[PDB]
Amino acid sequence: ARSAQPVTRLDQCYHLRWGAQYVGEDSLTYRLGVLSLLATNGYQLARPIPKQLT
């Protein structure tokens, strides 16, 4: 991200609205929701992200 360069939309992460009961307490969905919440708020990974994922 840059101050001047804009993007199509500020937030890329989906938000889980319904279905908390069927999601486990420590399943992958809960952890991924935490990661999405972190990504929306401005956190960023320390490890580099490749331009094209593998």
Partner 1 sequence: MLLEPLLSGDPRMTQLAIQYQQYNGRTFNVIPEMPGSVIADCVQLTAEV
Q: Which residues bind partner 1 (CB under 8 A)?
A: 21-22, 24
To the nearest whole angstrom, how small is the minimum distance from the Cβ of residue 19 to partner 1? 13
Residues contacting 30, CB < 8 A, separation 6+: 23, 24
For residues 6 and 24, which CB has a smaller minimum distance to partner 1 in the complex?
24
For residues 24 and 50, which CB has a smaller minimum distance to partner 1 in the complex?
24
Find, among 51, 50, 13, 45, the residue nearest to 32 by Cα: 13
3-state secondary structure of 34: helix
For residues 25 and 43, which CB has a smaller minimum distance to partner 1 in the complex?
25
